[model samples]
Target chain A: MQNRRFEFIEWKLFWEGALNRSDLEETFEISTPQTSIDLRRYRELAGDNIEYDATDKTFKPTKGMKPSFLKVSADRLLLQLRALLTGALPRKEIWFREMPPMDMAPDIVRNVDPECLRLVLEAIRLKRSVEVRYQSLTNSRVREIAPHALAFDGYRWHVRAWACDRDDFRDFVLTRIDDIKPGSLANYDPEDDVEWTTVVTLDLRPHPGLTEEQALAIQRDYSMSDGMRKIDVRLSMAYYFIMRMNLDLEDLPPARAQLSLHNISDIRKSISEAKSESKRRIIARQNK
Target chain B: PWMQNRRFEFIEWKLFWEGALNRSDLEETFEISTPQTSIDLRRYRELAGDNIEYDATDKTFKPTKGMKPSFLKVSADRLLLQLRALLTGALPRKEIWFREMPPMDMAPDIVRNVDPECLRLVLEAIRLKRSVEVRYQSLTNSRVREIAPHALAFDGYRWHVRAWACDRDDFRDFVLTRIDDIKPGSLANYDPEDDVEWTTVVTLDLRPHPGLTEEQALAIQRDYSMSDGMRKIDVRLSMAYYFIMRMNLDLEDLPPARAQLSLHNISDIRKSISEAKSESKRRIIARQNK
Candidate 1:
């Protein structure tokens, strides 16, 4: 079975590398000795040719391991980080609970662009006002603002900062920023009373008469693929709302098509209802 | 038939950069303690009903045995999502900190609508052969148009759909923002044109800009040469080619020199930028525009 093979491979790599068994167990939480034996057997089958390293309390090649292990790990981490920033992965699943060691940060920035990240971190740490030469969906512009928070809306990395020129908090895409410089050395506390006010909810429904490809497209967005006639999901509103709205429903026609859901009006209706509900909740909470 | 080959081969790189099969988390998701878990993971291909093999380079399981290193599709997406959540300050116990994204004067509609999920869907549609009915907000006015998507073109600038419209019975480009209402459904089977008429090839004779010195220019020139100079630029575009033009070049009344030139035909440029395409294409595109 492929699952068995993958487990064997994971176990083999862990053994071949200097990965601590306890660390593996802690990270992967392998509790059983039988599982461990199966892992060892799998490694042997795969010709891992590993041996136990007493000093590191982990597995290592009997001869040696790749000198580029650190580099390899860094590279892998970089890919993960890029995926995270770009919304290729869902926001909720980014595994904020456990982080790799600090050494990996360099690799993460390297994947995206260390210079851009460095400028961003400097802007964040110093809390100094700054300006960015930015390119947007339409044109390029220079924006002066007090930076607040960093967020990835779903596709690219972004920063939510209080735009001094706009006099309000705004989200800026990091990749589009051509250049950044510390402006006024003025400092503003990040934990101010103001909060991000724009929260739009969209209720999406699967279109009727879905095609196989359309069904697949919807499945791509969600983790499940049941034979349901209709499906819906809620997403936060942002610059990508229209695109997201278009995608969430099955609107594409068949043959020379990818997705198949129809009747996007349900999504439109969902957005309207959600909007009213959100307003009601806001008003009620404020009144309270 | 031409549409089929063009569509997949078209944005292949974008698919790579954007549509890679990530499996890092899936590797992590397997419970390591139980023998069943180990067995299932070890035989991941069997368990997942895929014909993947073990890849030692990535220290992960892969779909095929002999292929070059790649991520497990499940892992890539999960990890990508997890990273964004942490960066956005939406996740708890953030391990990594992120600076705010820079600001640009984006169209209000685009700012309101596009996201990763949307792009993913667009990519999927291109791969699957689908048409979309959209309420497009045109410069002249907004109207509903049914279009068979040929490709999702990106010019290092923005996302545009190169599609064949049923209403117009011609090829056209629809800015994602201009699509106000999208009702996807199957239209009557219509075969796209076999040989595209607007397959224009433009050659750019780029010498390094005067701003750079001889060495700097030469170095830049070398880089472009390695990228395949502008000569290899060919666009097998439909009406959507015009949209690529509008997005990249501000095609105003001017001689060729002053007019903003697209680095490649929309087709070529899309292939160059997409993460899925071979680096060779980018290298070729970087060369002199002879």
Candidate 2:
């Protein structure tokens, strides 16, 4: 209980820059004497963190004082604001005495099957394989996979694993997994999956066909240092990266394409190489 | 102690969110004795003084004009994060303090299935400044990669680790969900300063698409908090791609009528975007050969 009060004090100081006895009293519903004691206690614990001002009858954080109890993350602060805008949190939870109007793009909440998530997470935790009934574009079938990791491609969840039947690494969409059963311990070496481990860099540049002024505009929009930008992504995720940015591999009229893939050949090469290798493996299986 | 904590939390919620509270509220919420509730109210008066006043007409404590909160720093982001956590079952229902919530709906956002263990390991590596050997499945094949993690970032959609790749000998962003396995490697020195892109900040100037009508443009400007026909967003050089993608600023080729927002300062960010693209492509090629 005391720690919670202390945290509240720290948070108010961090965000509002100052705190008064009344502020604490109103929130904690404590007596004035108790509020004074809590403030004094806080001062004693972190003397360098704050100092009392006589004129305002308030305490303010010292210039050099670092947060002792709070994590002080930018993400945490931003998420809190988002909460307020979404009506997920009441305005009172924030330290700002006055808040400006804010808004956010409406978003949809996806439904996740708790049972499926539980089984998938358990498999990852135990480092075991699981047999799952997966719905695929071609057909729905059961397959045994040694699930290792889960991924989000901006729109959906996918599990990267080593397929036992195909004997290769594959991505299984979580939503497509209709049923799942835990499997026995399997000694599947993740290191053997070379594609999952490789890093790929995508070079992005404005469409060369644009006028200098238009090209310059494109440059400024992306904050490019020298008319170019580099993005490093896992090779497995390169497709999603391309799709997300809507980068076109083929050349389009500058007036039609805003951005062009600078390393189109490299990305294309990697894609084709994967395709040929998979095709070769299929032929090998048929021969066997 | 539990009762005290509950009472304090309840007081904060009522005073800030609901704008009022009374002895009955405390008694009903906690199922406490009337005497105890009165003591809590008295204590509140002694502490808050002028922030709240007893209203005989309503039989409740009403917030005073110009009342400044002392107990909490209320933030919209924090509330949203907690709400998301609660909805995802990351937090307990009892932890939510809001008494009433409006009917809410959201667009279907694909939730990334990031393994808890993977997240923990990456965070630990970043905190400890340790290199990690991870099994990552790329498009071509799955392989083991060594990286020294420096920070964890969420690009509005997914979690990524900003790390220095041992193979490429440069900084890179790795998706958390794509990592297959992780093992702590040798201690490594990671200077965040050397990451020029990560440290450099860029500002984006945005306006409603020129093709939009005056009313539509004004609406867009209002939605983004633009001042005098322009909205400025500050972003890190490293995360420019995600920001651009999220804002649909990369739709430069589309007609102004098609894209709702136009990048007014495109030339300013072009160099950084181009550089990032080149760096990413080089790393992709390097991985392909290895």
Tens digit of lDDT per residue, candidate 2, span B230-284? 8676777777766666656776666553356788877668887667646655654
Model 2, position B39, has a per-residue lDDT of: 82
Question: Which tens-of-lDDT digit does each residue in A29-120 have in candidate 1?
Answer: 46657447645764555454456668766655444433222222321233344444455444344322232211110011112444455456
Give one digit per residue, the lDDT tens place, for model 1 in B45-161.
333345444456655443342222222222322433455444433443333212222222121111222543344334434445677676765544556777776554332223457
> Relative to the unseen true structure, what is the C-alpha lDDT of residue B251 in candidate 2, on a scale of 0 to 100?
62
Candidate 2 local lDDT, A1-288, one digit each (tens)? 776677778766765667788887887788999988988898888777888899887888787767776655534444565555555666776655544222233332234554465567557656779999875544567898878776556444567877888777788766667689988776566655545565667777878777765665455434455877676666667776675555643444564455677897798688667646654654565466
TM-score for each prediction? Answer: 0.33, 0.45
Q: What is the lDDT of residue A255 in candidate 1?
A: 20
